[PDB]
Structures are given as C-alpha cells and as structure tokens.
Amino acid sequence: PVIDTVVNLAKRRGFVYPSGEIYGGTKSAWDYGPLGVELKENIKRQWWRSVVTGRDDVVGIDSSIILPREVWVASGHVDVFHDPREFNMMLKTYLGPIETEEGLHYLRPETAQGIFVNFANVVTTARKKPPFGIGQIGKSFRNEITPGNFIFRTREFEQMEMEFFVEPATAKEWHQYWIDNRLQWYIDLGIRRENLRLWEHPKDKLSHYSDRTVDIEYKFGFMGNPWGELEGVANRTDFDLSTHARHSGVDLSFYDQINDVRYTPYVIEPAAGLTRSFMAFLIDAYTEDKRTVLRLDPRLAPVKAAVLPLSRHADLSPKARDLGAELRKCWNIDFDDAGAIGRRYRRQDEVGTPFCVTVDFDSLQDNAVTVRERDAMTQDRVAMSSVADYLAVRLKGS
Amino acid sequence: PVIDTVVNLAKRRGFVYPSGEIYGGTKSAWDYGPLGVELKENIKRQWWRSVVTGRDDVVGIDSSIILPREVWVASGHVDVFHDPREFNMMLKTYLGPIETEEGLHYLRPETAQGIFVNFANVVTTARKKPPFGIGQIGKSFRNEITPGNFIFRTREFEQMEMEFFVEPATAKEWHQYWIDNRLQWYIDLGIRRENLRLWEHPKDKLSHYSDRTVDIEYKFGFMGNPWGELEGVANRTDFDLSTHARHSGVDLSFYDQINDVRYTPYVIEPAAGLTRSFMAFLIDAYTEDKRTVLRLDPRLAPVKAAVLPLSRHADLSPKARDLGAELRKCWNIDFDDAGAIGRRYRRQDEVGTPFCVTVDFDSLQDNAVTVRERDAMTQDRVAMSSVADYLAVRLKGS
Ligand SMILES: Nc1ncnc2c1ncn2[C@@H]1O[C@H](COP(=O)(O)O)[C@@H](O)[C@H]1O
Ligand SMILES: Nc1ncnc2c1ncn2[C@@H]1O[C@H](COP(=O)(O)O)[C@@H](O)[C@H]1O
Ligand SMILES: [Ca+2]
Ligand SMILES: [Ca+2]
Ligand SMILES: [Mg+2]
Ligand SMILES: [Mg+2]
Ligand SMILES: [Mg+2]
Ligand SMILES: [Mg+2]
C-alpha cells in the first residue's frame, strides 16, 4: 500500500503531525509541520497565480468562515445538507452572550457562498464584466460521518474555489475551457497523467441546478476503488445568484451598459481542495527506484536547496554558512552538516529537495561548489558567485 | 476622524466588504475584497520571511483551528478565559453524530497552543535545538463582548504568532532581541515611528507565568485614548511546556546532547495580529496632501503597477495589452483605459499602487513608456524592453 507508506513518510519528516497528538488527537485532524506548511503554501501560490492573479479576468476575495445564518438557508444547506434518521453536516456555534436562535451560526461548509453574496460588491469595486471570475482559498468545515483516508476527507479542510460568471449563452464553451485548464494544471505541476481522469456525471447524478458536472479524479490508491474525486468543475446555471437575490432581496443581476441588457450570469465553478491536492501531489511524487525519492515539482518542493558541507570541519563552515545565508534571501533552504554526505543527500531526496549544494575542501581553492540534481543525480561544479543564478533558472516560477 | 475616512476608502475600493452584507451582516465580520486579500497576503509574506523562512533558527507550522478539548483545559482557558456573572469567551462547536460532552470542542482562541503541543514533534523532525522558534499564521476566534473599532477587535481574526524556545538563563537577552526586532519590522515596512511606542507592563499587570511583557502599541486614532495594542512580546518562562507536559503526561523537556543536560526551555513570544496589522498599515499610509494617496510600502501595496493607455484608441491597445501580460507574469497588475489619464493616476494613488505605466502615441514610435512614481510623481521615459527591470529594482522584496 503506497498510501500508508506515504503517510508514514509525511509524519516522520514533518509534513504532518496528528493534531493534538499528546492528548490523543481528534478524528481526522492533522497539523501541517515545517515541510507541510511550505508545500501547502506552494500549492496555494500556484493555484492563485494560475487561476487568479496571473489572469486579467479573475480577482480574489477572502470571506469569513462565519457568515450570517441566512446565507445557509438561501443556499439550501439548512434543508438539504444532511446524511441519514437525517443528520445535518454543518458545524454550529453560538456568538454573543446568550445561546439563542439569534446567536446560532454555522461554520461554512464551503467557501463558495461568500463569493456569490459578494458578486455585486466585486462588480462595483473591481469594475468587472462577464466573463470574469472570483477566486478564494480558505477553511471549510463538515461533520463528516466517516472521515479518514488520511487528509482526503476531514472535518476541517481547505478549498480553492473559483466562480466564473458568464453570459448564459457562452456557458458551454467556458465550461469546457475550465475543465481543460484545471486538468492540465495538475499535469503541469507534475502529476502523472495516467493517474488522472475525468468523470462526466450522468444526467441522473446532476444537481437540480447543474447543466453539466465533470470531476477530475485522482488514483489515490484506496482499497477497493483506488480513485477519488480531486476537483469538481460544474456548470451551475444561474441558480446561485438567483437564490441569493430572492432570499436577500438584493438584485444580483448584471447590467451590460454596452449592449444595454440586464441578465443573471451563469456560473462555471472549479472547486478544488488544497489539503486533498496536497495528498495527491505527495502520493504521486513518491518513488522507490535502491532510492526513496519524492519527485515533487521544484515549484512545490518545500525546501528548494540544501547546503551541505562535506564534513563539520571548521574550514568549510565560513563558506557554507555564507552561501546558505545568500540563498536563504531567495528561497527556503536547509543547512545540514550531520553524518556522511551520501546519507545527507538521501535525506533531502526523501523530502523532494530539488538541489543539494556541497562545499568541499576543493571549494577552498577554486571557490566553487558541486550542485547535485535530485532525480538524475547530475553533479555540476558551479562558481560560488553563480550558484544563485544556477538555481534560479531551475526554480523559475516558484 | 482619520479612521472613518480610511474605513470608508477601504470599503469603497474593495479592501473590505461587510461579511454577508446583503443579509444584514454579522457584528464585526469583514470580508477581504480584491485589494484586501492581496494586502493581507503581502503582510503575511513579509512576516513569514522576517520571522520564519528568512532565518536559520525558526521553522513554521499550520495547526488545526479545532484541537482536542483538553488543550484548552491545560492552557487554563476553560477556567480563566471569561469576562463578567462570568462568561467564557471561547466559541464552542460539536463534532460527530450526537451532541455530547465527548463531542464538544472549542474553536481555538489563539494559535499558540498548537505550537506548544508540537514542540517535541518539531524538535524531532526538524532537528532543532534551543535557541530556535516555531512560527504560525492562522485564524483564531473569540466571543468578544464589545467587538468593533472596524477590524481591530473582531470575533474571527488572524494572528501571526511565534514561540522562541531558549535556554532559561538566556531568556532576558532574547526577549530584548525580539522586542527590538519586532518593533523595527513595522518601521521597516513603512509605519511612521512617532505612531508606535512600547508599553512595559508593570509587575502588577503581568500574568502569573510572565517575567516581562512589552506591547508594541500603534496610534490608531480611537476616540478617547488613540493608542491600541498592536503586538505583545512576552517572556512566558517555562509555563507553557510545563503545563502541557503535566496535563498530557508527555515529557516536553529538551535534551542537550552536547552538554548532556535536560531542561524545559523558556519561551519568548511575539504575538502579532494579521488583521489588526492590516488596519494599522492602512491608517498610517492614508495621506491627504489636493491629493489622496495611500503611501503603502511597495512590498505591501496590493497592485504593483497599473498599465494605462493614454486613451482607448485602438492603436495603443496592442502595446498596452502586451505590456500588461508581460508584467502580470511577475506581479499583480491593473489595466485601466477608462476616462481621463489624470483621474486614472489618482485612482491608483488612492489604493497605493507604486507605479503607473502610460502608453501614449509617442510610444508607437520610440517603443518606450512613461513610468510615474506614486509619491513624488516623477515620470521617467523607459524602453518597453526595460520596464520590467525598472520596476523590479523598485519592487525588490515583494
Ligand atoms: N471533507 C473534505 N476534506 C478534504 N477536502 C474536501 C472535503 N470535501 C470536499 N473537499 C475538497 O473540496 C472540493 C470541492 O468539494 P465540494 O464542495 O464537495 O464540491 C473537492 O473536490 C475536494 O477536493
Ligand atoms: N479580537 C481580536 N481581533 C483582532 N486581532 C486580535 C484580537 N485579539 C487579539 N488580536 C491580535 O492578536 C495579538 C495577540 O493577542 P493575544 O493572544 O490577546 O496576546 C494582538 O496583539 C492583536 O494584534
Ligand atoms: Ca486522525
Ligand atoms: Ca460589523
Ligand atoms: Mg459546493
Ligand atoms: Mg462532487
Ligand atoms: Mg496568547
Ligand atoms: Mg496583551
């Protein structure tokens, strides 16, 4: 089972820790350790660049976890978000002094509703016109009945969701665009294409408001069926703005000044999972070749380079430490002088570090270092003054 | 009142929106709009670089909002975190099927406890030895009795907290180091030093476990007393690891292999507020000189450059759009061709954009553009092929 092996590596090296481990934990709750917080941040950076700020037609928001309760009546979650005896899967809390119906709030089960209710605000302040999107990354909460499979299905998780508002007659081509774009995003960041597939929902598996839904599925390797949903890309017609306009009383239609027409945009929704993606990138990268290597895209790898003096000899520290401080101004780096150099390469390979930089006794005469590439183990001798440039060309886009 | 004027600008331009505005909102709940999410991200980036990954002695974590309940008994929050009739300020929720004492959990009122309970995990996986720190950014929740003053004191907020673990005999010099370093961080990012001060807590205002606490205070401009706490920097002695070791039964002391000694580290804690800092940076940057200019540090400004064709003429779009696409690969940028150019400069000044790049009819012959600097309004004519380099030298560290 690749999955358990990857989970064990993730714990051993501090990608993750069980939350509250010393108190026995809480079911499905995982903390991100020193390497995990950096990998998670890198995934966020790549999504935000590809979907939001790298585009001229998508803007971002960060809306609150706790919204007014009526948001979740309008969205239908109060009446429908239940799994059987029906049990509602939203987490409740109480705000203010007394516990009353007025104080009752839900923690959001998805980030998307905070986008929809801000549609008119964003049109106004960002001066946007369909086709355009609003993207968001954040925490969501669900009282999952059977959480587990590591971080695949947890009660507290993070999503990366974008709502793309379009003229209704253009929705089918924009849906296809976003299906194609989102699938390719995973492949471009290194997931092997044979471990990804698309699942076109049959008509009898569509929501009442979706004209089409396609899931990107990843071959996680679960027992039984090894595939799982990674990201859902839905054509949500005009249901979301319509329902919030009806329940709130605020017009959420769009006025097209050029063609003087008013309409309610259709929505194409790429709904991805930050913590679920983290799991897929780790599993897919895990390789046993003997070598254990985490073949992470260099833009995702948590540590970009490790500075490794050949030994603890005092003559090598000045250079090695000076080099580490220079590189640390640019990237997250590691410094390690403990034990045999070959074992130190293997320690970095195991967590995906794309380059190791070795300072040896020849470095004291030629003022150069050896740079080792993780996967092929090529070793180039590089002038000290050129190491950062050498790394930068190979880490571009991080 | 500068504060109301800044809040109004923040709403009008989409730094913030009231959460769930169309449903009447919830007290103290603010969403971050297109400009606000970028400013908030930039503040996070600068803190994480200065306190965590730019250092060789601090690592990061991202622990769960919902931890095992016993964490908050051990920390003393269940018995002490109450304001009078006593009222506990932690937000509660229930996990799993039935609402039972076993299902009751608290949303974290601070991020620091998730750091302490992972001390031994981080020592193990990151191979750290005091003096070293663990930093974290994340959401915290408090049932504030009188929330308000915009985003200064809200029920849902974000903190930037680091716990610096030291040999006990070194705590006083490390405390002073971190006081000095954290104060200077705000000044380096552009807050005017006359609007910052330190408040040394008198002995009768210290917690039972703090040997010394110093607050960084900012002159927000509140009615009555215009100063407010911005960040607290406390020497927390050995209370935090000791209490968790006692309640959990897990030894959280540190073993020093070199000197073969075992001890419980003292803790120096810089506890900052991401959303409170956001407010201070905006207020301090707001300037009326007539001009309204948000004098934000270019590393914090949400939009780094705006590409502005002199007019909507079709001959200027090809170049202006090509230039925008080139710059967008590097930074968040804006493109605006609506209305008089001078009003468009002022629109960018109002949100802090450090540079405007104007494409005019002379650009079609000399293949150069004018770059305007926000504060002084200097205008340099810059070759198209050099614009990104020109901006990069001025945006270094973003
Ligand atoms: N309980 C969960 N734990 C982790 N990720 C989730 C969970 N539920 C949904 N996701 C992620 O969020 C995406 C959108 O979910 P949904 O809102 O159910 O369409 C999914 O494709 C997953 O990547
Ligand atoms: N209710 C709140 N809303 C926003 N920021 C807060 C709130 N409470 C505390 N903070 C921030 O968190 C820092 C540490 O808070 P404390 O945990 O109370 O020491 C403070 O200096 C503020 O910057
Ligand atoms: Ca678990
Ligand atoms: Ca409010
Ligand atoms: Mg959804
Ligand atoms: Mg689905
Ligand atoms: Mg605290
Ligand atoms: Mg305080």
Distance CA B35, CA B16 (A): 8
> Does the CB atom of residue A153 touch ligand 1 within 6 A?
yes
Handedness of CA B202, B204, B205, B209 (dihedral sign): positive
Any idea what DSSP says for residue A290?
Answer: -
Nearest C-alpha to atom 23 of ligand 2 is from which residue?
B273
CB contact under 8 A, A33 and B94: no
Chain A nearest C-alpha distance from B203 (Å): 32
Q: Is there a contact between B123 and B263 (Cβ–Cβ < 8 Å)?
A: no
| Residue of B144, B229, B240, B267 best suited for mutating to test ligand 2, as the one with most atoms within 8 Å of CB | B229
Burial of B288 (0-12, 13-18, 19+ CB in 10 A): exposed
User: Residues B170-179: contacts with CB within 8 Å, 24+ apart?
Assistant: B170/B131, B170/B266, B171/B211, B171/B235, B171/B237, B171/B266, B171/B268, B172/B212, B172/B235, B174/B131, B174/B268, B175/B212, B175/B214, B175/B233, B175/B235, B175/B268, B178/B233, B178/B268, B178/B270, B179/B214, B179/B233
Distance CA B42, CA B36 (A): 10
What are the angstrom distances between the C-alpha of A17 and each of A30, A149, B59, B81, B133?
6, 15, 14, 27, 17
Cα A108–chain centre separation: 18
Query: Ligand nearest B16 Cα, by number?
Result: 4
Whole-angstrom Cα Rg for chain B = 24
DSSP for B49-80 reads IIIIITSSSEEE-B--SB--THHHHHTTHHHH
DSSP for B286-351 reads EEE---EEE---TTT-S-SEEEEESSS-TTTHHHHHHHHHHHHTTS-EEE--SS-HHHHHHHHHTT
CB contact under 8 A, A125 and B34: yes
Q: Is there a contact between B371 and B356 (Cβ–Cβ < 8 Å)?
A: yes
Confirm whether B367 is domain-assigned.
Answer: no
Residue closest to A266 by CA, chosen among A136, A180, A164, A121: A164
The SS3 assignment for A200 reads: strand
B74 marked ligand binding residue: no
> What method was applied to determine this entry?
X-ray
Partner residue facing A34 (CB), from B60, B139, B250: B60
Number of structural domains (chain B) is 1
> Does the CB atom of residue B109 touch ligand 2 within 6 A?
no
Whole-angstrom Cα Rg for chain A = 24
B229 marked ligand binding residue: yes
Residues 6+ apart with CB under 8 A from A85: none
Confirm whether B101 is domain-assigned.
Answer: yes
B22 touches chain A (CB under 8 A): yes
Domain of residue A259 covers: 2-285
Angle at B45 (CA atoms; ends B67, A183), nearest 5 degrees:
80
A338 touches chain B (CB under 8 A): yes
Name the one residue in this structure whose structure tokens are 């000045």.
Answer: A318
B308 touches chain A (CB under 8 A): no
CB contact under 8 A, A33 and B121: yes
Ligand 7 centroid from CA B112, angstroms: 6
Question: B296: which 2 tokens?
Answer: 């934000």
Nearest C-alpha to atom 17 of ligand 2 is from which residue?
B110
> Does the CB atom of residue A229 touch ligand 1 within 6 A?
yes
User: Residues A75-82: contacts with CB within 8 Å, 24+ apart?
Assistant: A75/A113, A75/A240, A75/A243, A75/A244, A76/A243, A77/A106, A77/A109, A81/A109
Work out the number of other CB atoms within 10 angstroms of the CB of residue A231: 25
Pairing of strands B333-335, B305-309: parallel
Residues 6+ apart with CB under 8 A from B50: B181, B185
Burial of A339 (0-12, 13-18, 19+ CB in 10 A): exposed
In one-letter notation, the amino acid at residue B365 is Q
Distance CA B103, CA B95 (A): 5
Work out the number of other CB atoms within 10 angstroms of the CB of residue B279: 23
DSSP for B179-243 reads HHHHHHHHHHTT--GGGEEEEE--GGGS-TT-SEEEEEEEE---SSS-EEEEEEEEE-TTHHHHH
Q: Within 13 Å, how many C-alpha atoms sit on residue B222's CB side?
A: 17
Determine what percent of chain A falls in helix, strand and coil, rounding each to the nearest 5.
35, 30, 35
Handedness of CA A134, A135, A138, A140 (dihedral sign): positive
Handedness of CA B362, B367, B372, B377 (dihedral sign): negative
> Does the CB atom of residue A29 touch ligand 1 within 6 A?
no
B328 touches chain A (CB under 8 A): yes
What are the angstrom distances between the C-alpha of A172 and each of A52, A255, B97, B195?
21, 21, 40, 55
Question: B170: which 2 tokens?
Answer: 């070194």
Work out the number of other CB atoms within 10 angstroms of the CB of residue B378: 9
Chain B nearest C-alpha distance from A288 (Å): 21
Confirm whether B395 is domain-assigned.
Answer: no
The SS3 assignment for B246 reads: helix
DSSP for A38-99 reads HHHHHHHHHHIIIIIITSSSEEE-B--SB--THHHHHTTHHHH-EE---EE---EEE-SSS-
CB contact under 8 A, A33 and B118: yes
Name the one residue in this structure whose structure tokens are 């699942």.
Answer: A199
> Does the CB atom of residue B154 touch ligand 2 within 6 A?
yes
CATH number at residue A181: 3.30.930.10
Distance CA A293, CA A380 (A): 20
Q: In degrees to the nearest 10, what's the CA dihedral of A198, A199, A203, A209?
A: -70
Confirm whether A118 is domain-assigned.
Answer: yes
Handedness of CA A259, A260, A266, A272 (dihedral sign): positive
Preceding-residue numbers of gaps in chain A (C–N over 2.5 Å): 84, 289
Query: Ligand nearest B156 Cα, by number?
Result: 2
Any idea what DSSP says for residue A169?
Answer: G
Distance CA B105, CA A102 (A): 21
Residue closest to A32 by CA, chosen among A3, A10, A6, A47: A10
> Does the CB atom of residue B228 touch ligand 2 within 6 A?
no
Residue closest to B60 by CA, chosen among A352, A302, A234: A302
Confirm whether A95 is domain-assigned.
Answer: yes
Q: How many CB pairs under 8 A join A and B?
A: 226
Confirm whether A306 is domain-assigned.
Answer: no
Confirm whether B380 is domain-assigned.
Answer: no
Q: Is there a contact between B21 and B301 (Cβ–Cβ < 8 Å)?
A: no
Ligand 6 centroid from CA A283, angstroms: 21
Strand partners, B93: B105
Confirm whether B359 is domain-assigned.
Answer: no
Ligand 5 centroid from CA A112, angstroms: 6
Contacts of A54 in chain B (CB under 8 A): 328-329
Backbone torsions φ then ψ of B265, nearest 5 degrees:
-55, 145
- Tell me, in Å, the resolution of the deposited structure: 1.6
Q: Is there a contact between B350 and B323 (Cβ–Cβ < 8 Å)?
A: no
Distance CA A75, CA A96 (A): 24
What are the angstrom distances between the C-alpha of B198 and each of B223, B228, B273, B276?
20, 11, 16, 17
Question: A134: which 2 tokens?
Answer: 């609003």
A184 marked ligand binding residue: no
B339 touches chain A (CB under 8 A): no
Q: Containing H/E element for B251?
A: none
Any idea what DSSP says for residue A385?
Answer: G
Distance CA A357, CA A309 (A): 8
The SS3 assignment for A285 reads: helix
